[PDB]
Amino acid sequence: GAMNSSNYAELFNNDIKLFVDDTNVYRVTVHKTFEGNVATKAINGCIFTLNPKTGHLFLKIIHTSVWAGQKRLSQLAKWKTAEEVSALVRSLPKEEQPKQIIVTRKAMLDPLEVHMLDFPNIAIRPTELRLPFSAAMSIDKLSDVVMKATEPQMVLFNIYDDWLDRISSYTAFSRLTLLLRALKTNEESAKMILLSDPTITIKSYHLWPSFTDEQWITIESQMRDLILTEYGRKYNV
Amino acid sequence: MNTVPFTSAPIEVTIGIDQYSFNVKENQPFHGIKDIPIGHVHVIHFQHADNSSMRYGYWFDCRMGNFYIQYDPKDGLYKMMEERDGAKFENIVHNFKERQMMVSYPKIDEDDTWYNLTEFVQMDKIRKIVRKDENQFSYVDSSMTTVQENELSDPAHSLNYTVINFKSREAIRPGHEMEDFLDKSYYLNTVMLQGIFKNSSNYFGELQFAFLNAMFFGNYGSSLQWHAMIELICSSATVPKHMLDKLDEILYYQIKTLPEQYSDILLNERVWNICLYSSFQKNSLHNTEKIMENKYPELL
Ligand SMILES: CCOC(=O)C(=O)Nc1cccc(C)c1
């Protein structure tokens, strides 16, 4: 069924599973026309499909050409997401196929279920977790690949860099969600925290800086302070 | 006009005949129902006074044989039987008619209600939904499950309605996932009408039979089937105009006949609101929308 805090360790067991977040698939800027009406202009998007145990991120770049001449784009975007996730599953060897796909938004349930009818043994589930995966486009290297794309493209990343050499996937996922929540809540402040120190860099093959264990504790504390600070600003607390 | 003779009425029982009903007392001198209109299927149904559990009954057509009801004290119910000896049958019916031991089917001349509810219902199709080949009539009861219910348990005692499932490979062509899920026309026209039912008359017959089993027996699986067959049409962008107009008539008479006090258990709010106000056919069922809004505005 649905996935929440009671069955949270389930994310890190040995049953292959993927989170699918469609929040960045269909992206627009809204602007006034010469006649004073309003129009949208689509910009490139992406599907965020993540294995929370391994950190493997299947980033399908959604080029704006896929919307050309199409109607009801916000509805189409859900079905396009389901089509692409289904195509990904079919492209994987059987022993790499997920046993569960967890969608971050309940509106993805029917599109994905319908596209996956050929896979009756893959459970399609919602979650009661509020996951900050919309902030994926605040990760500079992911944003760059999405905005530079001139055609549909799939790019594979490990969103945990090399952290699993030193920490469990439970801890890695917790770190990831803290970082993304901070980037979602105050992107400039979060990026300042992550990059303020010039002596700590991002390896060419990584997404995040090369913090030592003790530095990660400091960073994590600064991110929690940011989130709490923004909560106080928001609610006048 | 034909007749269904009762050996006797040893237990107090409410008897239905089509949309009519009457009470018989324990051991009352009742010997059946006369003046049954030739040309339609009929249903004779029972609810015991001392045990309202199991409504049950028999669909039949007097053109297919001579049928009589006898109470079975072992199985505890009124059973329909066929009498092969026609002269015997005529002699027994004549005696009970002469002694005025029978109720008369009370059809008003103005009244097309039963025709309107059974226009497309034929005994031959009933006997394929209800499988008991040795009898020319068909037993149904409150508790019988459908083939679809038994997939989601005795298969011999099931209602073999056509399985409709909107999230099934049958309903969704590979490569047409969004199209087929949002517009059921493929599933209605190619799979169901051209493929399974062969024509709209057979589709409407099953829909009408499902409604009648829902209403007369409180059969839950039948109510599910009726709603599914409605929703399949309403959720299709492309439906022949004659089908939409006929569906409006079919539903109008069904809603007209439904007992008001059973509307909470016989009508699915989600399906009706979707069909009348959101679906492709929201503006195609003018008669049904008008009666629904005037009779059951709470549901909407
Ligand atoms: C046990 C054999 O019994 C019968 O054959 C029988 O009851 N026939 C019948 C025919 C018409 C009317 C009624 C009331 C009975």
Side-chain angles (χ1 to χ4, degrees), chain B residues 5-8 31 68-70 82-83 88-89 92-93 96:
Chain B
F6 271 61
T7 293
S8 66
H31 294 283
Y68 71 86
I69 296 290
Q70 183 151 119
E82 166 166 18
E83 173 53 59
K88 180 206 192 173
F89 189 89
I92 296 167
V93 165
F96 289 149

Side-chain angles (χ1 to χ4, degrees), chain A residues 75-76 79 110 113-115 117-118, chain B residues 167-169 172 174 177-178 181-182:
Chain A
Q75 183 178 65
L76 180 57
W79 290 87
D110 279 349
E113 180 178 357
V114 168
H115 270 276
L117 288 174
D118 284 341
Chain B
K167 297 197 261 178
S168 69
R169 182 41 82 230
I172 303 294
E177 288 84 5
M178 186 183 192
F181 186 70
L182 296 182

